[PDB]
């Protein structure tokens, strides 16, 4: 089957991965409060262009 | 936290077969030691000898130190650590100092200066060495009476009258009824025989809703009576209450 | 045998209570070890007190024990009426056998009495066909455990068939026994009524069949 | 010498066991199909041994073999009395009983050991 | 009434488990932890 | 009066029920059978010299022949 | 007890970032094409753990969490105060100051241990 399933990608032991709570975050630079989290939410590989 | 067996045995003459059994549940067979204990009504409780499974080591006291002779059986595992196995003994030369129930008692733990001291119990099997004859049980039917007119409470029980030896079990529906029972030992009298009586409390309620079987079990002789016991009374100060 | 405890010993509730353990350097204490165990007669004993102080698994910190050179006690707090009973202890090793004692029965006091409830049965109509006459007299409920029975032959003492159980601790931490009368039946038909005397702390109770009716 | 073996100890009692302790810890490193599965068994030995290494690390005792700590007994851990275990019971009886509480005390004995570290130092 | 026997061989994992009998695998745990009277040292 | 302290143990004999990752053994002469690989071994690690076997004295384990991993594993493999 | 989480204490007070180390090495070990990659990590995992260890090992330190030794500080290496570093900076703040002369450092407090080693024995 082709169906996107939610796929999350988790850090070995020894590293971490720093998710930016920000509601109003343009993508670079400084997200004021940041958590940590080892994976990440269920990202689907949804596969399109210009959507 | 299991509990062992022990097993009945025959009234006996100077010269019979002599042995019995003793089974178990629940523990691990072949660390503790066995202990074996006999308490008769003239020396007091003797200790004669211990034995341990898993090596077979018997250190016996030196007054069974020639005619008793213990056995031990093999493990027939159920779980990892819970097992269940056996153990008999036989003692010869039978005395008439011997009359009188023994047991059989394990050790309480595997190692140390402690090892084999008797932590956990049987139940009890009874002596009788006797040249007298075996006799069966004379089983009658007591009649109900009146414990308290205020509280509604009566008694009904059995009589095992002239049996010879000791003992004769006494139980009640096949195994139903067990709240309430009290028995009576069993007196001997000038002649070689034995008389006990025995008696279930239950309320004054109860007639037609239960059934009361009172099931004399002599193993000696090998009889079963189930008498059935009659919930009417002939007392005057229960007869207020029906 | 050879290892002497005390005759008896007594002590009231909420109170303790010590019993001597004591005998010869064969038995007693130098290089030895003592337990100690609740033994109610006829039923099968509970491991109070091994290794002289440590308590069985599953006995209450209410028990305690010690040993000296000589002698070794037992000390039972805040006394318990089912308590009441017989005690033994014994002096083992890790290699030789264990011996018991003498034996020590506890005599709690302050323990409110019963008054016996007997009840006396005639001869069957099972047993007048046989042809047998017992007179069947039970006691129960009574405490302390001494009853002295004594029947009589139409108000005159007999001294022919008597028996008598010893009295026995019950389920209920009560007392009984369990009297007959081995008599012929003419024996009581010359006499127009016989009864079973119960003799306790003075206090006599004494039940009659009147075989007329 | 008494040296009954690897595991040899496993069923007898736990003081008894205590005497063999170091045979256990020697043999746990024992330091293309064919070639995944043996290389994959490989590392997963260094790995089940570094997790065992690290709590025994962080919990401060570092020093292999049995280690004291300051932690007090919650008698609700399988209550009995210490001859009646010492003398008694075995490994694998005994972790059984205690394997329910077992996470709990982990993480006890870890916090403990640290504030002992800080306020030791200073 | 009675019963016949009839040769199978349908599956190939039962002609490992003819000889694969005897033998069971387990994870080592070295850590034991238990009581004693005693206490690190100050 | 003494209060109980826990202690730590390393090496203690306490092992669980699992499954993992086998590894196979072949005879020192098996690997002088050339033949250009007999099938299996081309890529196996030598049988000790020397083996041992250690009788778990006093211990019990329950086996299940039919609940076994390594005959699924054989198999696969 | 005070639990914020591992890495919680990244950026408070270098201070009270010392209160919670046991957190940060519990979780550092944390004992076909996605096999390799699993694999792989899982192997940079115990190497960057080791590398670490030997390094508290080879400055006789061994022992989990804060380790004194008596290498005089250079006052170059970002000259401030005791109470100007332990109740103000934060422990990313401060590694990026002492970056610069860290390696030196590393090398230093390699030396000094050995020679005391050698003749503490001797
Ligand atoms: C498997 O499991 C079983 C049972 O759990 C283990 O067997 C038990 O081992 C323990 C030791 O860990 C034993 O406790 C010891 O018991 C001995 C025996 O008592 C003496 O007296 C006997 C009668 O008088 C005599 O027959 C005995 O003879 C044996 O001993 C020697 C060889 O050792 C030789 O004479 C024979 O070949 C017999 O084998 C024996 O002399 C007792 O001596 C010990 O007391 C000392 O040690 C304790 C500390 O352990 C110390 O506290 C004491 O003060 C004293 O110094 C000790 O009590 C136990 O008897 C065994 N049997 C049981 C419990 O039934 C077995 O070991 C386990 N296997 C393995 C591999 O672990
Ligand atoms: C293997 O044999 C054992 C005993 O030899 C079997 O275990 C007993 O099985 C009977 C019934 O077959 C039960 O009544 C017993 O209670 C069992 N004993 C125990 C200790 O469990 C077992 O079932 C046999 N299994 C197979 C697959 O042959
Ligand atoms: C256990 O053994 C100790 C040994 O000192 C003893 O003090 C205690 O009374 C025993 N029993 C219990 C229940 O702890
Ligand atoms: C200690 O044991 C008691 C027994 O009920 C339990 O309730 C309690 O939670 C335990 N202590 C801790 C810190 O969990
Ligand atoms: C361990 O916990 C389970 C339930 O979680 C319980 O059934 C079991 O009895 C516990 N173990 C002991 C020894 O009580
Ligand atoms: C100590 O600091 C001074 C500051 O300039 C520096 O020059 C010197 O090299 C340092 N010491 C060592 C051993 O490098
Ligand atoms: C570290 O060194 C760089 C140049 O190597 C320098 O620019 C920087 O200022 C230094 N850091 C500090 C805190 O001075």
């Known amino acids: 089957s082709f169906e996107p399933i939610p796929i999350h990608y988790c850090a070995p032991a020894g590293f971490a991965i720093l998710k930016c709570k920000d509601k109003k975050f343009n993508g670079t630079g400084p997200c004021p409060s940041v958590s940590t989290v080892q994976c990440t939410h269920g990202i689907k590989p949804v596969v399109s262009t210009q959507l | 936290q299991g509990q062992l067996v022990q097993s009945g045995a025959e009234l006996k003459k100077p010269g019979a077969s002599v042995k019995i059994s003793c089974k178990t549940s629940?523990?691990?067979?072949?660390?503790?030691?066995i202990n074996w204990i006999r308490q008769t009504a003239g020396r007091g409780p003797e200790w004669m000898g211990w034995?341990?499974?898993?090596?077979?080591?018997?250190?016996?006291?030196?007054?069974?130190?020639?005619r008793v002779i213990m056995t031990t059986d093999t493990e027939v595992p159920v779980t990892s650590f819970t097992s269940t196995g056996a153990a008999y003994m036989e003692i010869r030369n039978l005395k008439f100092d011997d009359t009188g129930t023994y047991f059989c008692?394990?050790?309480?733990?595997?190692?140390?200066?402690?090892?084999?001291?008797?932590?956990?119990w049987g139940q009890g099997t009874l002596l009788t060495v006797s040249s007298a004859s075996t006799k069966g049980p004379s089983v009658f039917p007591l009649a109900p009476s009146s414990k308290s007119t205020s509280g509604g409470t009566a008694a009904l029980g059995c009589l095992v009258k002239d049996y010879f030896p000791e003992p004769v079990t006494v139980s009640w529906n096949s195994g139903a009824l067990t709240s309430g029972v009290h028995t009576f030992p069993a007196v001997l009298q000038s002649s070689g025989l034995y008389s006990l009586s025995s008696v279930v409390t239950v309320p004054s309620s109860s007639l037609g809703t239960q059934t009361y079987i009172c099931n004399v079990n002599h193993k000696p002789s090998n009889t079963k009576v189930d008498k059935r016991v009659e919930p009417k009374s002939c007392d005057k100060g229960l007869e207020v209450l029906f | 045998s050879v290892l002497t405890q005390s005759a008896s010993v007594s002590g009231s509730l909420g109170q303790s209570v010590t019993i001597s353990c004591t005998g010869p350097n064969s038995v007693c204490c130098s290089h030895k070890s003592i337990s100690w165990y609740q033994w109610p007669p006829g039923r099968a004993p509970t491991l109070i007190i091994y290794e002289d102080n440590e308590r069985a698994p599953g006995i209450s910190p209410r028990f305690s024990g010690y040993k000296s050179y000589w002698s070794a006690y037992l000390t039972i707090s805040d006394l318990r009426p089912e308590d009441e009973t017989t005690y033994y202890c014994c002096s083992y090793t890790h290699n030789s056998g264990c011996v018991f004692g003498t034996g020590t029965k506890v005599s709690v006091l302050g323990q409110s009495k019963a008054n016996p409830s007997v009840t006396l049965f005639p001869p069957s109509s099972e047993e007048l066909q046989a042809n047998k006459a017992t007179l069947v007299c039970l006691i129960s409920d009574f405490y302390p455990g001494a009853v002295t029975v004594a029947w009589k032959a139409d108000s005159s003492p007999v001294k022919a068939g008597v028996e008598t159980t010893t009295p026995s601790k019950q389920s209920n931490n009560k007392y009984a026994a369990s009297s007959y009368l081995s008599l012929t039946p003419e024996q009581w038909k010359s006499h127009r009524s016989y009864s079973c005397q119960v003799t306790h702390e003075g206090s006599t109770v004494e039940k009659t069949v009147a075989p007329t009716e | 010498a008494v040296f009954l073996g690897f595991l040899g100890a496993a069923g007898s009692t736990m003081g008894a066991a205590s005497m063999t302790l170091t045979v256990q810890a020697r043999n746990l490193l024992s330091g293309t199909v064919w070639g995944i599965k043996q290389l994959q068994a490989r590392v997963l030995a260094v790995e089940r041994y570094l997790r065992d290494q690290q709590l025994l690390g962080i919990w401060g005792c570092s020093g292999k073999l049995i280690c004291c700590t300051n932690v007090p007994w919650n008698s609700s851990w399988s209550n009995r009395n210490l001859s009646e275990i010492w003398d008694n019971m075995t490994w694998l009886q005994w972790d059984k009983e205690i394997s329910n509480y077992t996470q709990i005390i982990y993480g006890l004995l870890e916090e403990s050991q640290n504030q002992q570290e800080k306020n030791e130092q200073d | 009434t009675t019963e016949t026997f009839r040769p199978g061989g349908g599956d190939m994992r039962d002609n490992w488990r003819s000889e694969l009998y005897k033998y069971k695998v387990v994870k080592i745990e070295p850590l034991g932890v238990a009581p004693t009277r005693c206490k690190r040292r100050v | 009066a003494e209060n109980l302290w826990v202690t730590v143990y390393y090496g203690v004999p306490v092992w669980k029920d699992a499954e993992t990752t086998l590894f196979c053994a072949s005879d020192a002469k098996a690997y002088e059978t050339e033949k250009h690989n007999v099938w299996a071994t081309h890529a196996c690690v030598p049988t000790d010299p020397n083996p041992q076997e250690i009788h778990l004295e006093n211990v019990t384990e329950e086996f299940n022949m039919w609940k076994n991993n390594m005959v699924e594993q054989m198999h696969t493999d | 007890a005070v639990f914020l989480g591992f890495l919680g204490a990244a950026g408070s007070t270098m201070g009270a970032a010392s209160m919670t180390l046991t957190v940060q090495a519990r979780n550092l070990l944390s004992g076909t094409v996605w096999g390799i990659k699993q694999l792989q990590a899982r192997v940079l995992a115990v190497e960057r753990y080791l590398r670490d260890q030997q390094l508290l090992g080879i400055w006789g330190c061994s022992g989990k969490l804060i380790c004194c030794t008596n290498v005089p500080w250079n006052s170059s290496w970002s000259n401030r105060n005791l109470s100007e570093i332990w109740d103000n900076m934060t422990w990313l703040q401060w590694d990026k100051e002492i970056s610069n002369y860290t390696q030196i450092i590393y090398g230093l407090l390699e030396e000094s241990q050995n020679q005391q080693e050698k003749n503490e024995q001797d």
């Open positions: 629940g523990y691990r067979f072949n660390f503790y030691h």
């Open positions: 034995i341990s499974p898993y090596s077979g080591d018997k250190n016996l006291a030196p007054a069974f130190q020639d």
């Open positions: 008692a394990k050790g309480l733990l595997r190692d140390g200066s402690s090892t084999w001291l008797p932590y956990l």
